[PDB]
């Protein structure tokens, strides 16, 4: 079978840089062009660099040209990948591919100066108008944290119904953020009190944050 | 240069269905396309080569066609395994690029469609006077959980400082989704409002919020 196993990935500083390696089996590497493909987290397929059988001739993407160099070893039968001046929009899994029909199991490369940091969280008050009668929605903003994961409750655990709690974005920063919400009755918003507690463990920070109606 | 795929594709156990992929003369037109599966969390595999060949292991229920600008992969008797997303490919020689189009997710129906439901959160008086604006676009209630979101400052669209999160499940076996827009206190106060736009299947529904009210 196929075979194509990437090496080099991990954790980086942008302006840093890395080495892909990609090395293959099950057929005669010599004979084919390879590519690398990427894939940022959460998003679709961008395709960085095709290099020829020979190794003489090489392109790259738009986004790519004059910061990476593809390679080849031919007698070593494998693929590089030299990722130079690395900044947070490379941050992505990169798959080594034989011509564009079989793919490596791909390595994560992270572009990020973040360390560890707890979030800040911010009120999503629930509009003064939908608070006569009927729903409201209200939630928390867990804003700019660093690394995964935080928790996210509310009422120490005693509010559990209507809530969604989504995952984070990793934003350019390196840093990420979330959102809660929760959606209650529009009554309560006078006399019930609504606490989002988030946890941040790698950083031992936990924060209880008070979402109360605006004045409009 | 872009290739354009529909977001979302869909059908009952055992029909039919039809992924598109929408080029010009410089990719599509001229070069061969290629389809890939992916289900999320694993590197895509092949399903069509050179326009309309499949590699072993792919069942004939799969065929690729090409005319003109435009490619198609056809699915019939839709299976479980069938679910996940599918992306086109193609070189382009104006760009000396290969493309590949923003993927389609292939949902085997299991529940009646739904379609969403947009709150839109301006940003905090607290984030505010930390000297950051976040616009918080929150999705609920849809089926299939694929959705496109667009922003705009006043009528113009902005690309810039915009985070989606993929769609996920609710208590309720539906599907949620959050978007972000990044500005600077300026942009918000200075525009008259910003809109977060949902497209799903063939409805778009906006949402809009003003600095100037509540």
């Known amino acids: 079978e196929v075979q194509l196993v990437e090496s080099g990935g991990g954790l980086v500083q942008p302006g840093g840089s890395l080495r892909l390696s990609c090395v293959a089996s099950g057929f005669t590497f010599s004979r084919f062009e390879m590519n690398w493909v990427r894939q940022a987290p959460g998003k679709g397929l961008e395709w960085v660099s095709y290099?020829?059988?020979?190794?003489?001739?090489?392109y790259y993407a738009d986004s790519v040209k004059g910061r990476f160099i593809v390679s080849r070893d031919n007698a070593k039968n494998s693929l590089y990948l030299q990722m130079n001046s690395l900044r947070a929009d490379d941050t992505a899994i990169y798959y080594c591919?034989?011509?564009?029909?079989?793919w490596g199991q791909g390595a994560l490369v992270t572009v990020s100066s973040a360390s560890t940091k707890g979030p800040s969280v911010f009120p999503l008050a629930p509009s003064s108008k939908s608070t006569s009668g009927g729903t409201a929605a209200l939630g928390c903003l867990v804003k700019d944290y660093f690394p995964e994961p935080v928790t996210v409750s509310w009422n120490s655990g005693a509010l559990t119904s209507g809530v969604h709690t989504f995952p984070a974005v990793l934003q350019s920063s390196g840093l990420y953020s979330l959102s809660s919400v929760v959606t209650v009755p529009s009554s309560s918003l006078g006399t019930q009190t609504y606490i989002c507690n988030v946890n941040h463990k790698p950083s031992n920070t936990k924060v209880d944050k008070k979402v109360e109606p605006k004045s409009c | 240069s872009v290739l354009t795929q529909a977001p979302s594709a869909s059908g009952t156990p055992g029909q039919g269905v039809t992924i598109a992929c929408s080029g010009s003369?410089?990719?599509?037109?001229?070069?061969?396309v290629y389809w890939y599966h992916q289900l999320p969390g694993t590197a895509p595999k092949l399903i069509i080569y050179?326009?309309?060949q499949r590699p072993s292991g792919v069942p004939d229920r799969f065929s690729g066609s090409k005319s003109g600008t435009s490619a198609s992969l056809a699915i019939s008797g839709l299976r479980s395994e069938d679910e996940g997303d599918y992306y086109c490919?193609?070189?382009?020689?104006?760009?000396?690029?290969?493309?590949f189009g923003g993927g389609t997710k292939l949902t085997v129906l299991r529940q009646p469609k739904a379609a969403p439901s947009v709150t839109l959160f301006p940003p905090s008086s607290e984030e505010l006077q930390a000297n950051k604006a976040t616009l918080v676009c929150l999705i609920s209630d849809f089926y299939p959980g694929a959705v496109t979101v667009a922003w705009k400052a006043d009528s113009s669209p902005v690309k810039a400082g915009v985070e989606t999160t993929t769609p996920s499940k609710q208590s309720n076996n539906k599907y949620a989704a959050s978007s972000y827009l990044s500005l600077t206190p300026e942009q918000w106060k200075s525009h008259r409002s910003y809109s977060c736009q949902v497209t799903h299947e063939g409805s778009t529904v906006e949402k809009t919020v003003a600095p100037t009210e509540c």
């Open positions: 003369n410089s990719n599509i037109g001229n070069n061969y």
């Open positions: 591919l034989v011509v564009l029909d079989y």
């Open positions: 050179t326009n309309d």
């Open positions: 490919a193609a070189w382009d020689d104006s760009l000396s690029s290969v493309l």
């Open positions: 290099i020829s059988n020979s190794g003489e001739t090489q």
